[PDB]
Design a protein around this nucleic acid. Structure first.
Ligand SMILES: [Mg+2]
Ligand SMILES: [Mg+2]
Ligand SMILES: [Mg+2]
Ligand SMILES: [Mg+2]
Ligand SMILES: [Mg+2]
Ligand SMILES: [Mg+2]
Ligand SMILES: [Mg+2]
Ligand SMILES: [Mg+2]
Ligand SMILES: [Mg+2]
Ligand SMILES: [Mg+2]
Ligand SMILES: [Mg+2]
Ligand SMILES: [Mg+2]
Ligand SMILES: [Mg+2]
Ligand SMILES: [Mg+2]
Ligand SMILES: [Mg+2]
Ligand SMILES: [Mg+2]
Ligand SMILES: [Mg+2]
Ligand SMILES: [Mg+2]
Ligand SMILES: [Mg+2]
Ligand SMILES: [Mg+2]
Ligand SMILES: [Mg+2]
Ligand SMILES: [Mg+2]
Ligand SMILES: [Mg+2]
Ligand SMILES: [Mg+2]
Ligand SMILES: [Mg+2]
Ligand SMILES: [Mg+2]
Ligand SMILES: [Mg+2]
Ligand SMILES: [Mg+2]
Ligand SMILES: [Mg+2]
Ligand SMILES: [Mg+2]
Ligand SMILES: [Mg+2]
Ligand SMILES: [Mg+2]
Ligand SMILES: [Mg+2]
Ligand SMILES: [Mg+2]
Lengths: 101, 116, 87, 70
RNA sequence: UGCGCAGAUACCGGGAGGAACGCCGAUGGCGAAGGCAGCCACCUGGUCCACCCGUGACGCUGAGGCGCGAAAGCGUGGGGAGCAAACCGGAUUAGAUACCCGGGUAGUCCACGCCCUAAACGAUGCGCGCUAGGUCUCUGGGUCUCCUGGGGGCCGAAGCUAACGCGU
């Protein structure tokens, strides 16, 4: 496997029912694709620099996973399917290159 | 018949013409003028004088609707792009702000032979 | 790709003695590993010519090493060939 | 004029999620500032470009803005 | 000429579709050449440095052969926004079979198969060894004013050249 970072931006209008739904949906997808989750950062409401889906804000999730490489692309497909999921971006993890150190 | 009293004035400045639209704050237009609206016909439309008179025609046409506060949007380069703004300032309309929103592509569409 | 695990598995299979990493045998082994990786990669991806160059050169080097082992001690050559199933 | 790296701390050039620092490297418009203005190295600018673009796809940094002047 | 009172241009909002990636951007990088610029992931080739570890001359070139090969063009099926041979107009002109302006088909894009040319240029075949330096730069390593490799530039020793110039 390799260690990746899953960024997910979804619609910032969900009540608790729907948000819990989309989130445990992301859980289920990750289970089906074999992603061991090492850490998570839920930023949530953030003002976007431009309108996305006519919506000026976005609800942000950041996952750090370790999973089989050949399953990354399929995983992203499975994620973008949901309507409420607006941005999916998976990045291979990287060493934090410092500057002005 | 509207009484907007505040809105947007768009200066479209090309080399062949300068034309001014004046809209309400939601973008919907009210009145407008251009280089051909005032008497000029040919090349004389792209001159900065015609830009002045077009700007002023449209500003006076905005007065009757009650315009006082105006935000200026500017698209394009060309003579009398500045002259239209300077006419817009002394037009009696108080100019709230001035923005350049000229659309530039990110190298998407092939230009005509003239522009390469 | 080819992880160091698989690599060392191969080197250790073909080492002429422990700690041997540069044998002609170890060489043609490793070469042929990447050769097969590349050829399977090129069954699909037929339109990828810049790697196909990589493969041509690899077969070149493999044949030069084998043509050497043939000359010096042909017995080990036959053992290597028979082990990898070549020619 | 001072340069951006000069007036800045120890920051991760690869972190696409840090908007507070990345916004320091864009112009009035959404453009990426040349190395003459950013004070970064060839490698450093090469990395900043990518992380800024990643951040732009996330809706964090803009693609372009409007100039308020002239 | 064209388009516009069947309401265009200019402005706001929604939608469709095709093509190309602004800033970064470089006098930069990569590649054997052709050539390669949004971003992510997968597969994948080359290459460079440090250690001095392994093999022990296994090397260099290379007629044939084989693979690659910008653009244009050819075949079948898609696709088709912008541009645009041919072509239709408008001008200019002595004439205009053109430069300029309004249109527009192939094509430009995709798949698969052809074609095999080029100012395909460094107009400079490949490999190795030897011959002052200085300076700018990309990228490794180091005891990191610097030293030491590998690329990309500019001056210039010896030398070469008809000359221009070339010159680790
Ligand atoms: Mg979706
Ligand atoms: Mg005109
Ligand atoms: Mg100028
Ligand atoms: Mg051009
Ligand atoms: Mg009509
Ligand atoms: Mg008519
Ligand atoms: Mg009609
Ligand atoms: Mg619109
Ligand atoms: Mg669309
Ligand atoms: Mg269509
Ligand atoms: Mg540039
Ligand atoms: Mg030794
Ligand atoms: Mg020995
Ligand atoms: Mg050769
Ligand atoms: Mg030949
Ligand atoms: Mg060809
Ligand atoms: Mg072609
Ligand atoms: Mg065709
Ligand atoms: Mg066709
Ligand atoms: Mg056209
Ligand atoms: Mg034409
Ligand atoms: Mg004609
Ligand atoms: Mg005529
Ligand atoms: Mg004449
Ligand atoms: Mg060429
Ligand atoms: Mg010669
Ligand atoms: Mg060679
Ligand atoms: Mg030098
Ligand atoms: Mg160093
Ligand atoms: Mg090179
Ligand atoms: Mg050098
Ligand atoms: Mg001399
Ligand atoms: Mg010289
Ligand atoms: Mg030497």
């Amino acid at each position: 496997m390799r260690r990746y970072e899953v960024n997910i931006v979804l619609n910032p209008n969900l009540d608790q029912s729907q948000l819990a739904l989309e989130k445990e949906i992301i859980q289920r997808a990750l289970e089906n694709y074999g992603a061991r989750v090492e850490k998570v950062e839920e930023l949530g409401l953030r003002r976007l620099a431009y309108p996305i889906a006519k919506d000026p804000q976005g609800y942000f999730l950041w996952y750090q996973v370790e999973m089989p490489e050949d399953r990354v692309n399929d995983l992203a497909r499975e994620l973008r399917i949901r309507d409420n999921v607006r941005r999916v971006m998976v990045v291979k993890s990287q060493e934090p290159f410092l500057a002005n150190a | 018949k509207r009484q907007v009293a505040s809105g947007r004035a768009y200066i479209h400045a090309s080399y062949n013409n300068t034309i001014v639209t004046i809209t309400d704050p939601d973008g919907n237009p009210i009145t407008w003028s251009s280089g051909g609206v005032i008497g000029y016909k040919g090349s004389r439309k792209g001159t900065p004088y015609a830009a002045q008179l077009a700007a002023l025609d449209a500003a006076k046409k905005a007065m009757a609707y009650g315009m006082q506060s105006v935000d200026v949007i500017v698209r394009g380069t060309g003579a009398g792009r500045e002259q239209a703004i300077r006419a817009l300032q002394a037009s009696g309309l108080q100019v709230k702000s001035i923005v350049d929103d000229t659309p530039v592509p990110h190298n998407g569409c092939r230009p005509k032979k003239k522009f390469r | 790709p080819i992880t160091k695990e698989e690599k060392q598995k191969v080197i250790q299979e073909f080492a002429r003695f422990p700690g041997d990493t540069g044998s002609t045998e170890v060489q043609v082994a490793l070469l042929t590993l990447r050769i097969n990786r590349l050829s399977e990669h090129l069954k699909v991806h037929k339109k990828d010519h810049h790697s196909h160059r990589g493969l041509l050169m690899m077969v070149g080097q493999r044949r030069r090493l084998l043509r050497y082992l043939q000359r010096e001690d042909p017995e080990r050559y036959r053992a290597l060939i028979e082990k990898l199933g070549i020619r | 004029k001072a340069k951006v790296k000069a007036t800045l701390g120890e920051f991760d050039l690869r972190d696409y999620r840090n908007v507070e620092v990345l916004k320091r490297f864009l112009s009035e418009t959404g453009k990426i500032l040349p190395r003459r203005r950013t004070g970064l190295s060839a490698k450093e600018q090469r990395i900043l470009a990518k992380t800024i673009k990643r951040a732009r796809i996330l809706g964090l940094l803009p693609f372009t803005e409007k100039l308020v002047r002239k």
